[PDB]
Nucleic acid binder design. Structure first.
Length: 849
DNA sequence: CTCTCCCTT
């Protein structure tokens, strides 16, 4: 047992703390207490019966409305706006199947529609279903909710389906995503919404009484949300006999869903695309004759294949396929030669080059942009080159989507981002390296890693379509066909890699009280060790009690659209009055950093972050300083100038602000705040006291802790609370710094790539951890009196302080348990505020003098 | 000294 620094407190401070705690100790309507008591008291049969009654709206139809839309439908079909658009709609493959789909819905509870891009299922199947019910005179009874994996798709589709109906957005077609909507009309409407939007609406409507038809789109992606939603539908539909569900899927393991729901009917709808030719490694080396120089394993895979084809390819073609570096991206110059080949031969079209990561995209850009070979110096001015990456600005400007100036060919070097989320239409040529980067979690060592891996068969098929948008294209695969045979069908289903705390808690609101029972009934059941490791977290942070049942704090956390640890952080900041700095910290972790990392500017960006941190040694606070600067830049009308100098995305910043505004309004609604404004000065009085901000950021990220012992940029020896060596990720403001006020850090996400990295970090002080943490006990180790936290970091402390801090932690826990059952803002002058001031006092003693 | 990608009445 090794001892750390002295946390003991002055007598005048300790004397005052005791004066306050004992003021609080002298203290003596809640609808929430009853609601929480009721959710625990009801069994599942009763939970069902009640939610039927409260969502009764759809048992009521408006025949005068029915008659009116049946009549305005038949009438506007003789007009000249529709009847081309009805006749151009009939050009879609789906429209041939209109009639057979309706009959399948009438005759079956769940059906499955399997179709590839362009078959029109997403745009047409909702219109198909709705227009039958308008014509049969049912129009008011019909409400269709169609879930999408991505926000962009939810809007675009809603605007497209809307232009096709000769309406503005917001009449019969509407979209709903997080913090934005054009809602369609109450009845006779199609709403496109993200899968997450629907799961939250289930808390008020767990059995879906508020829709006639559900359409899950892009279930083949195995998004976490879709797999849970299908799993819930096994529990829902038995009590929803009149409900009609349309599952919708690409042609990727389509049978899994057909199997999952009984043997339910399946429709396969033929695609619309331009044909794209597939070439593989042998086909590439045959055209360009590119030559290589600067385990096996690999020999065992390729040698069987070389024999079967030996007379289809030149012996110097087959001979090159023996090299481990011919497949994937290992030789970048090779991929450079192919782009150079496609520019010399071949028709005009854009080139899409899929490469695994940032590092590799930079490699090819620098080969293309400042080329050393003679062939490249020829082409350099004739290529218009965009890197495309989620941390790079390119996707947020119009440049990469528009076609290049005459006499130039547009060449994108991209990650997996251009596979779905971002779509470039003039791409006729796709170079698929077959390599990407993936996160993997190892339950045994509790290390998440990001490794370079081969893509799967489904990845390859989907990357091919991205060239078939405009004209017949080509897909160039840089791995052999024999390699494709060792590739998986699909990537690992998302639920199998993800932290389970947030779900397990959410299911409780739906009266699913045993997560091991439910989550096992999914298409893929998670590892049950991961559920446990998850329920064990929800017990630690006191959302579930030791028996595993929801606590009053737990019912709140499951009601907030953020992971359980930070929803609590946000609650702490309501009571401790740091709301604006904290909800910035929270929303940045839930979503993402505002900073771009454009190519070549890396050192310049670390400078902007270091200056934005204001030497606060906090990445989380660093983002908040950025938002404070952003809000002034909107006040100074300087906004664009601002985001350019600091490499910031104003699209992302507006979202963080929108999230923060949400957290405010939920807290104000839950009776934890007096104003729904996260800038309200009443709610922020403590928002400047940096030791307090670190104290809540600690209360939020605990138990993720790190310990720094070294010196020198500088060299760091730091270990996490488990003993494994870690370093600040090079993008964290804290990499390479020296001179920290404290050697202890809290972190959100730990990750191994080339080293064990902490991705973002906040320096905290021992006294703060010990208050808000757990595993606090006092004793004597040698002859030294100590105070520790988590039975790991033991600090020197004298006894008058231990007895007071330990008495302080009791009165804090008592307060929290009460504020959760009986929500109310802490009165500024009341008894509860007294305990707050006691903690503000103690934490303030760490201030930088 | 480095960064695959979605997303939550």
């Amino acid at each position: 047992i090794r001892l750390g620094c002295n946390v003991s407190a002055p007598s005048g401070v300790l004397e005052r703390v005791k004066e306050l705690m004992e003021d609080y100790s002298r203290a003596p309507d809640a609808k929430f207490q009853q609601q929480f008591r009721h959710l625990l008291s009801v069994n599942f049969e009763e939970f069902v019966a009640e939610t039927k009654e409260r969502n009764a709206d759809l048992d009521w139809v408006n025949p005068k409305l029915d008659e009116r839309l049946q009549l305005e439908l038949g009438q506007r079909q003789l007009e000249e706006n529709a009847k081309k658009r009805l006749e151009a709609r009939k050009k879609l493959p789906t429209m041939k199947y209109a009639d057979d789909i309706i009959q399948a819905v009438r005759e079956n509870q769940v059906i499955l529609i399997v179709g590839s891009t362009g078959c029109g299922k997403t745009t047409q199947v909702p219109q198909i279903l709705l227009d039958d019910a308008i014509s049969r005179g049912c129009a008011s009874s019909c409400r269709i909710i169609c879930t999408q994996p991505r926000r962009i798709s939810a809007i675009a589709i809603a605007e497209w389906v809307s232009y096709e109906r000769c309406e503005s957005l917001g009449n019969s077609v509407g979209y709903q995503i997080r913090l934005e909507s054009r809602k369609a009309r109450e009845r006779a409407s199609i709403t496109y919404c993200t899968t997450g939007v629907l799961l939250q609406q289930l808390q008020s409507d767990p059995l879906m009484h508020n829709l006639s038809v559900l359409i899950l789109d892009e279930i083949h992606e195995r998004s976490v949300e879709t797999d849970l939603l299908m799993g819930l539908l096994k529990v829902i539909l038995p009590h929803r006999p009149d409900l009609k569900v349309i599952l919708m899927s690409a042609t990727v393991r389509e049978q899994d869903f057909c199997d999952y729901f009984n043997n339910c009917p399946m429709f396969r709808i033929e695609g619309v695309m331009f044909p794209v030719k597939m070439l593989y490694l042998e086909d590439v080396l045959s055209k360009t004759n590119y030559e290589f120089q600067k385990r096996m394993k690999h020999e065992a895979m390729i040698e069987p294949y070389l024999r079967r084809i030996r007379n289809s390819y030149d012996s110097r073609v087959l001979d090159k396929l023996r090299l481990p570096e011919s497949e994937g991206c290992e030789d970048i110059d090779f991929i450079a030669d192919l782009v150079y080949y496609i520019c010399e031969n071949e028709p005009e079209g854009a080139i899409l080059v899929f490469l695994p990561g940032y590092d590799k995209i930079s490699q090819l850009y620098n080969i293309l942009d400042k080329p050393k070979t003679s062939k490249g110096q020829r082409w350099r001015d004739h290529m218009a080159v965009f890197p495309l990456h989620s941390l790079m600005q390119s996707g947020e400007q119009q440049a990469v989507f528009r076609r290049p100036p005459a006499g130039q060919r547009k060449v994108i070097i991209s990650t997996i981002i251009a596979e779905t989320s971002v779509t470039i239409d003039d791409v006729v040529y796709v170079i698929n390296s077959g390599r990407t980067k993936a996160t993997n979690y190892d339950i045994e060592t509790n290390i998440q890693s990001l490794d370079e891996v081969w893509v799967t068969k489904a990845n390859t098929q989907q990357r091919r379509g991205r060239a078939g948008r405009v004209r017949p294209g080509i897909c160039y695969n840089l791995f052999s066909r024999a390699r494709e045979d060792r590739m998986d069908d699909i990537p690992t289903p998302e639920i199998l890699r993800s932290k389970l705390e947030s779900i397990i808690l959410s299911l409780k609101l739906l009266h699913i009280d045993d997560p091991y029972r439910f989550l096992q009934t999914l298409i893929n059941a998670p590892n049950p060790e991961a559920i446990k490791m998850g329920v064990e977290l929800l017990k630690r942070i006191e959302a579930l009690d030791q028996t595993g049942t929801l606590t009053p704090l737990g019912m709140h956390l499951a009601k907030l659209p953020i992971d359980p640890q930070m929803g609590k952080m946000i609650l702490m900041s309501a009571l401790f009055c740091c709301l604006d700095p904290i909800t910035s910290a929270a929303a940045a972790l839930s979503f993402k950093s505002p900073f771009y990392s454009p190519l070549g500017k890396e050192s310049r960006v670390d400078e902007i972050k270091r200056r934005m941190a204001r030497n606060m040694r906090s990445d989380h606070l660093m983002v908040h300083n950025t938002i404070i600067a952003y809000r002034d830049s909107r006040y100074s009308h300087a906004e664009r100038d601002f985001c350019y100098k600091n490499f910031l995305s104003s699209m992302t910043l507006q979202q963080l602000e929108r999230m923060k505004n949400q957290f405010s309004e939920l807290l104000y609604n839950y009776k934890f705040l007096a104003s729904s404004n996260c800038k309200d000065a009443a709610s922020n009085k403590n928002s400047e006291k940096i030791p307090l901000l670190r104290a809540i950021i600690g209360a939020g990220l605990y138990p993720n802790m790190a310990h720094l012992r070294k010196s020198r940029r500088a060299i760091h020896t730091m270990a996490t609370d488990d003993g494994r060596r870690v370093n600040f990720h090079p993008s964290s403001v804290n990499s390479g710094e020296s001179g920290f006020d404290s050697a202890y850090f809290v972190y959100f996400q730990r990750q191994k790539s080339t080293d064990l990295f902490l991705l973002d970090s906040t320096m905290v002080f021992p006294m703060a951890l010990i208050i808000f943490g757990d595993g606090v006990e006092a004793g004597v180790t040698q002859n030294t009196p100590y105070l520790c936290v988590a039975k790991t970091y033991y600090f020197k402390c004298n006894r008058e302080t231990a007895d007071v801090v330990i008495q302080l932690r009791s009165n804090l826990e008592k307060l929290l348990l009460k504020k959760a059952l009986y929500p109310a803002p802490i009165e500024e002058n009341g008894y509860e505020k007294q305990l707050i001031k006691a903690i503000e006092l103690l934490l303030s003693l760490d201030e930088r003098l």
